[PDB]
Amino acid sequence: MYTFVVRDENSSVYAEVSRLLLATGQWKRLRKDNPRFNLMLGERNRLPFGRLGHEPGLVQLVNYYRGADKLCRKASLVKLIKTSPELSESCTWFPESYVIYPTDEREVFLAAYNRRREGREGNVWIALISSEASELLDFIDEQGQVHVIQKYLEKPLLLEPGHRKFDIRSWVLVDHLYNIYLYREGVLRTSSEPYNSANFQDKTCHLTNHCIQKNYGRYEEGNEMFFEEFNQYLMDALNTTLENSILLQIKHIIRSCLMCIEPAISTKHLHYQSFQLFGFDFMVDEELKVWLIEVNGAPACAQKLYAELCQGIVDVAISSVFPLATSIFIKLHH
Amino acid sequence: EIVHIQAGQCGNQIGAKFWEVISDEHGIDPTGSYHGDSDLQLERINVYYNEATGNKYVPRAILVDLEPGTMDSVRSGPFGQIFRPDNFVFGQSGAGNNWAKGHYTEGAELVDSVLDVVRKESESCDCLQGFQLTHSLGGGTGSGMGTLLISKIREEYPDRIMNTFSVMPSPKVSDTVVEPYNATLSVHQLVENTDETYCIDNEALYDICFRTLKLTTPTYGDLNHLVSATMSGVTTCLRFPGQLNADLRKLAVNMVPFPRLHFFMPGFAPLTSRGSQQYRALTVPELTQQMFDSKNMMAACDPRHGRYLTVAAIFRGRMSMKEVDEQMLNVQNKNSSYFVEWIPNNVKTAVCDIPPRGLKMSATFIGNSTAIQELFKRISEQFTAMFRRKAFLHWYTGEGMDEMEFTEAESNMNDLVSEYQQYQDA
Amino acid sequence: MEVIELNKCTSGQSFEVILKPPSDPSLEEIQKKLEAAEERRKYQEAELLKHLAE
Amino acid sequence: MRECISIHVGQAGVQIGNACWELYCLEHGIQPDGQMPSDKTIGGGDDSFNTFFSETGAGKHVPRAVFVDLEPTVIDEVRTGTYRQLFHPEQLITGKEDAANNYARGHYTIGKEIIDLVLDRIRKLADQCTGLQGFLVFHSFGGGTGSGFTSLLMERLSVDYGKKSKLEFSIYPAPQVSTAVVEPYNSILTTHTTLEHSDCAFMVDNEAIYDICRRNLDIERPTYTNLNRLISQIVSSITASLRFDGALNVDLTEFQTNLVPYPRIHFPLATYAPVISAEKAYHEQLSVAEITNACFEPANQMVKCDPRHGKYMACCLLYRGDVVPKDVNAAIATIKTKRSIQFVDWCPTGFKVGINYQPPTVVPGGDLAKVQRAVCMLSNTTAIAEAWARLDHKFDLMYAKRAFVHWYVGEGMEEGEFSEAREDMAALEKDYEEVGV
Numbered sequence A: 001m002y003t004f005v006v007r008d009e010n011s012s013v014y015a016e017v018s019r020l021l022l023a024t025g026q027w028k029r030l031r032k033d034n035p036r037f038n039l040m041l042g043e044r045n046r047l048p049f050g051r052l053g054h055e056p057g058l059v060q061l062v063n064y065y066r067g068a069d070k071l072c073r074k075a076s077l078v079k080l081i082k083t084s085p086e087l088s089e090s091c092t093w094f095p096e097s098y099v100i101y102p103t104d105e106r107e108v109f110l111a112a113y114n115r116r117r118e119g120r121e122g123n124v125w126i127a128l129i130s131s132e133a134s135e136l137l138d139f140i141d142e143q144g145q146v147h148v149i150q151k152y153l154e155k156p157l158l159l160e161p162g163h164r165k166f167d168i169r170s171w172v173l174v175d176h177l178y179n180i181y182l183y184r185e186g187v188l189r190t191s192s193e194p195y196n197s198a199n200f201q202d203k204t205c206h207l208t209n210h211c212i213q214k215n216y217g218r219y220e221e222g223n224e225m226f227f228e229e230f231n232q233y234l235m236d237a238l239n240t241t242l243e244n245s246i247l248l249q250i251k252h253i254i255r256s257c258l259m260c261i262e263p264a265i266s267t268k269h270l271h272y273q274s275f276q277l278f279g280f281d282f283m284v285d286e287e288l289k290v291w292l293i294e295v296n297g298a299p300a301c302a303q304k305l306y307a308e309l310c311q312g313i314v315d316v317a318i319s320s321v322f323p324l325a326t327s328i329f330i331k332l333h334h
Numbered sequence B: 001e002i003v004h005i006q007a008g009q010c011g012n013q014i015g016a017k018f019w020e021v022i023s024d025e026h027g028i029d030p031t032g033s034y035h036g037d038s039d040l041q042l043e044r045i046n047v048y049y050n051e052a053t054g055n056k057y058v059p060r061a062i063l064v065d066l067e068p069g070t071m072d073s074v075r076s077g078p079f080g081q082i083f084r085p086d087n088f089v090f091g092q093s094g095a096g097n098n099w100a101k102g103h104y105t106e107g108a109e110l111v112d113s114v115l116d117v118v119r120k121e122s123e124s125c126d127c128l129q130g131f132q133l134t135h136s137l138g139g140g141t142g143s144g145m146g147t148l149l150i151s152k153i154r155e156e157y158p159d160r161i162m163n164t165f166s167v168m169p170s171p172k173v174s175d176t177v178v179e180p181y182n183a184t185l186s187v188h189q190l191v192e193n194t195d196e197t198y199c200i201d202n203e204a205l206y207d208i209c210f211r212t213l214k215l216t217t218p219t220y221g222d223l224n225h226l227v228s229a230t231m232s233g234v235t236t237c238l239r240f241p242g243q244l245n246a247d248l249r250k251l252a253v254n255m256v257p258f259p260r261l262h263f264f265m266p267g268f269a270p271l272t273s274r275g276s277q278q279y280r281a282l283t284v285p286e287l288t289q290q291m292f293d294s295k296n297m298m299a300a301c302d303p304r305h306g307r308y309l310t311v312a313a314i315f316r317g318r319m320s321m322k323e324v325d326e327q328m329l330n331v332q333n334k335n336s337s338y339f340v341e342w343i344p345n346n347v348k349t350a351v352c353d354i355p356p357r358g359l360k361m362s363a364t365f366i367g368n369s370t371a372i373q374e375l376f377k378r379i380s381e382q383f384t385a386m387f388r389r390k391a392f393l394h395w396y397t398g399e400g401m402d403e404m405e406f407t408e409a410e411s412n413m414n415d416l417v418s419e420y421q422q423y424q425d426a
Numbered sequence C: 001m002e003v004i005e006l007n008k009c010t011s012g013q014s015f016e017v018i019l020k021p022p023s024d025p026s027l028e029e030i031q032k033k034l035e036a037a038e039e040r041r042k043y044q045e046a047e048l049l050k051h052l053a054e
Numbered sequence D: 001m002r003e004c005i006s007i008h009v010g011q012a013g014v015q016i017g018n019a020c021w022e023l024y025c026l027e028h029g030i031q032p033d034g035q036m037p038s039d040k041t042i043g044g045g046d047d048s049f050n051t052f053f054s055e056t057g058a059g060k061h062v063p064r065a066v067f068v069d070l071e072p073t074v075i076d077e078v079r080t081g082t083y084r085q086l087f088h089p090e091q092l093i094t095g096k097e098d099a100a101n102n103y104a105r106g107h108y109t110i111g112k113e114i115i116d117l118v119l120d121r122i123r124k125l126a127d128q129c130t131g132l133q134g135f136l137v138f139h140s141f142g143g144g145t146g147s148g149f150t151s152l153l154m155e156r157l158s159v160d161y162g163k164k165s166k167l168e169f170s171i172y173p174a175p176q177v178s179t180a181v182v183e184p185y186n187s188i189l190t191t192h193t194t195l196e197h198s199d200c201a202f203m204v205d206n207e208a209i210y211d212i213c214r215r216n217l218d219i220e221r222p223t224y225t226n227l228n229r230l231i232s233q234i235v236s237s238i239t240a241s242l243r244f245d246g247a248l249n250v251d252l253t254e255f256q257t258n259l260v261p262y263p264r265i266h267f268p269l270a271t272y273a274p275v276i277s278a279e280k281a282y283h284e285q286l287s288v289a290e291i292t293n294a295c296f297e298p299a300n301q302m303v304k305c306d307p308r309h310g311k312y313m314a315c316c317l318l319y320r321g322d323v324v325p326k327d328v329n330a331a332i333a334t335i336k337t338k339r340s341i342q343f344v345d346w347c348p349t350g351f352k353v354g355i356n357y358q359p360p361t362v363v364p365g366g367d368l369a370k371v372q373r374a375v376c377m378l379s380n381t382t383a384i385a386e387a388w389a390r391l392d393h394k395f396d397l398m399y400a401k402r403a404f405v406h407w408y409v410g411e412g413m414e415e416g417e418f419s420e421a422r423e424d425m426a427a428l429e430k431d432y433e434e435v436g437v
């Protein structure tokens, strides 16, 4: 009889996990501040890692990797890729980005802005989306917090019919052995309104967040195209598959990012253990070249996939540590 | 050193039984002479025994009563000769199961004589640590005079530890109808003037003898076999050297987070009847499971109806301390809800290499549970049932008591109940 | 990289390697605290013997 | 030469002290009867080992140590121990009844009636010193004596010996071997009162030592004898520079300079390797690179924490055995590129290395195997704050209900001292935070 605690109520993912665990009749839920637990579904902020793995006679496990925030923060991700020799400044799959502080590398950003202007090529950027540097720097100083300036992909792959923009969400699970598991079912969070190349003011077709969109539900249910449909579209329209044209680059980017920070977050020889579910956001251009947008440390799943993914987390991340009395994941070997 | 006292019929009969058991463990004969094989038996014998001229050890015990009946049975008992003759302090009138007689009139006439023996024993101690009393709360002498002694011992020794092995009354094992009165009046004294009170419920001892030991009609002898075994159990760490550098005060400190809440639930495993040798030794998981079970509690209270504040466990015999560590950590992790979270690691354990007589290994349990309130609530209901009609009250008013003092005792015990309830929901 | 302050002897040797450069109460008071605690103990003990006297 | 006086308080301090002085004697070649055949300067001298020993005309070498406990149980085993002749009665002080795991009882009540005696016996040793630099205090956080009386002693020493330094070897409480429940109280209380008086304190979590004895020595149930032998080895590595010829950490003041830039943050993390079982038949001797790399494994630290998620302010490497600077720098270069070693911006990213050619001595019949080379890393990392966080949490859980508080109040202490102590610890955790992130 294993025991666990829940310290994040807003977690739609681990609300299902806790439900699944209790349903096995071998997992009991304790109170929040009960230290005698085997599994901790911890909070998103101020997770007390320092209090884990100090309970005698208890193998403890947490659903978050300490230090993984360096990957899941926009300001941190840029610094991580730029400073790490494994990824380097000459990273092919990450858009040109710079860190900007409200009144740092602002002078470094303007240096690239000149080449774009004195080269007569695409000079559009994103934080709001604008082509003028002055309009951007004034916006950052007016917000308050730190922001990242990034190159805008002016030539995205556009779905037909509709001429629509989209982004790809991949769910990655890293267990305690640091096996990088890629959930086979991803989702395309598509735009319903056609992509406007000229007017960047209309952010309803530039930003593909599920919240903004909610022409909602015209092409597919809930502006969410799963892989079977998108794969079929690539075969019919572009005479290729999702595996070759896109997914190889995805698996490469996912694996490369996690291999980089592995020695900084690994719990191989620690007194407590860690696993975590990540949400990689990608962006495909017209030449079928994949770009990494960001990484989410506390991602939400798709309604169709909650039953399968949440069950998966129990199998490989939890039950692997705490056994009980074909696979949905793709193991990115390294 | 510890100064032992035993007051009244019950007190002297469990007290004598207690000295009988540990005397055998320390290798001391009724003659008083040591006859063992291990020096371990004598390394901490000074705690309970004074060394006399010759090679004979004399218990640091003081036998008190208002009737010579029981004390004459002790002196003619098995280890009747071991006791110091001067330490026999007895009246002639008796107490007639009357708390008033024992605390105010008959006992007050004798209490000074007792203290003279206590002082004479204390002045012989190199460094007196505390006292311990064996008595019942249902009668008159052990209940009334026993608490009177406690009050006066505290006045002269206000910085010493005071422990008690108090036998609680029960209708299942009852001598008179006025037992709830005597007990309620006694608890009032115990809440104030004791560091530790081991609540020994005759209801529990009876049920154990009947339901578990399968004794159809248990005598007071069958009941006392359980008490003596438990008492030998709790005092194990004090009487034998081990990893736990035992100390009277340290137990009182680590077991009692709040001064009034010092009423413990004793437990023992395996449960055994008189003379009935059982030949199968229990595994460590079996010892751990039984000692925590309600059937093994000497206080008729369901621990699942409350929460453990602190727990002391003492295993005896040759066994893997690792296996003990695993099984103890297992119980807590399996049932962590029954332990308060605002006292981290409140379950401590120790192991003594020397087992008790008759058993290859055993386990003794001392729990400070909030479930003990069930005991006090039980006495309270029996008390109220009579007091609302002021029944049998003339026995007490005749000795000079007033109805107000009963109302005060009723109130103070109800405060103890609610105080135990306060931390059951924390 | 850079080893500096190398000192050697028969028993051993010590040095420093740099990889990168940077970028009370008095006796009066004590005796007063200890005695203040003693008075608080004496007060509590007096209240007990006063309570027991009653 | 400048002398150093060792002070052992409480059960933990005394028993650990015995393990250390036992080990010191074996290292310097001193016999149980105090005789030192290799010491050709009979009757006195001022060699490096005289920092911890004084000499009699008879040629006996006595520890500059004072044992103090409020209970005679433990110190009596020193009076009758195998090194009984080594010390003399005036060094061993014992009381009648202990502090009963109560800080207030050890500090105020019983502490007051013996503090003058201890300081007098300490003053006797201080008079035998031509140039005293400071004190090494051994004690536990959990014990009433180790916590209570030590804080009082540390206060008076700062008054009676203002210019003198004072280092601590503290045992951080661990439920796995502890038998008390109120040790979080005593720990917060003694840390608060001692903080301003201590220049540098080496914490040793019993949890860490306990698991190292289980994992690396294959001892199912480690006893205090097992723990103390291993602890004494770490302490020996730290104090070797004071007892042997060298140029790194040759006086107590240098410990502060090298390991403690900020005064309040004076808790260096110790990491030791290799720990090998003596009953292990076949052992491939580890190299400089392997043992130096092991100094960055959390499983080898005296306190379990994660240095990766913190910042360094200083780092010293203390080798013993067959080691040379070349192999060290080669090992450092490899480790630097493979591990997360973040220093604070206002400190140089570097390592102060110290080597002693004599390999680490082990007690005959002990659990440790003789190794060709060993190392002890002293690194002042903010990651050790995790130990304060763990402890203060346990404190808050108990104090929220005022559990066991009446025991402290009953000894003359004010309840305000609980919160005032907890506030100081809250300030300390903040200091680590500012530096760490």
Ligand SMILES: CCC[C@H](Nc1nc(-c2ccc(NC(=O)NCC)c(OC)c2)ncc1C)c1cccnc1
Pocket: B132, B163, B196, B234, B235, B236, B237, B238, B244, B245, B246, B247, B248, B250, B251, B254, B255, B310, B311, B312, B313, B314, B346, B347, B348, B349, B350, B366, D179, D180, D181
């Ligand atoms: C929460 C319980 C903590 C308790 N700790 C101690 N317990 C004792 C101790 C002293 C006397 C006894 N025996 C007694 O009979 N005491 C009352 C007369 C004892 O039995 C439990 C423990 N001494 C020192 C310590 C530190 C303890 C530890 C291990 C096992 N049992 C009790």
Ligand SMILES: Nc1nc2c(ncn2[C@@H]2O[C@H](COP(=O)(O)OP(=O)(O)OP(=O)(O)O)[C@@H](O)[C@H]2O)c(=O)[nH]1
Pocket: D009, D010, D011, D012, D013, D015, D016, D069, D070, D098, D099, D100, D101, D102, D106, D140, D141, D142, D143, D144, D145, D146, D147, D171, D173, D174, D177, D178, D179, D183, D206, D224, D225, D227, D228, D231
């Ligand atoms: N490592 C180690 N820890 C010890 C040793 N002895 C005691 N301890 C620890 O010290 C804590 C309790 O403090 P003690 O030293 O035993 O008590 P004390 O200092 O004598 O103070 P008192 O309460 O008056 O007895 C416990 O948590 C133990 O784990 C020891 O020999 N080695």
Ligand SMILES: Nc1ncnc2c1ncn2[C@@H]1O[C@H](COP(=O)(O)OP(=O)(O)CP(=O)(O)O)[C@@H](O)[C@H]1O
Pocket: A095, A126, A150, A151, A152, A153, A154, A166, A167, A206, A207, A208, A209, A281, A283, A293, A294, A296
């Ligand atoms: N460099 C770029 N070029 C083109 N489009 C971009 C871009 N960066 C972001 N976008 C688009 O703008 C949106 C920005 O969303 P972003 O991912 O930055 O915010 P977010 O953090 O809310 C994602 P999530 O909510 O899943 O965590 C992305 O959905 C993408 O659709």
Ligand SMILES: Nc1nc2c(ncn2[C@@H]2O[C@H](COP(=O)(O)OP(=O)(O)O)[C@@H](O)[C@H]2O)c(=O)[nH]1
Pocket: B007, B008, B009, B010, B011, B013, B014, B095, B096, B097, B098, B136, B137, B138, B139, B140, B141, B142, B143, B167, B168, B169, B170, B173, B174, B175, B179, B202, B220, B221, B223, B224
């Ligand atoms: N276990 C046990 N309980 C007893 C014994 N004698 C009396 N009692 C209990 O004590 C109460 C009677 O008190 P009593 O011993 O007569 O007190 P006394 O007047 O001081 O002698 C009853 O409730 C009994 O349950 C005994 O020999 N064994």
Ligand SMILES: [Ca+2]
Pocket: D039, D040, D041, D042, D043, D044, D045, D046, D047, D055
């Ligand atoms: Ca000399």
Ligand SMILES: [Mg+2]
Pocket: B009, B139, B175
């Ligand atoms: Mg009777």
Ligand SMILES: [Mg+2]
Pocket: D010, D011, D071, D098, D143, D145
């Ligand atoms: Mg002690």
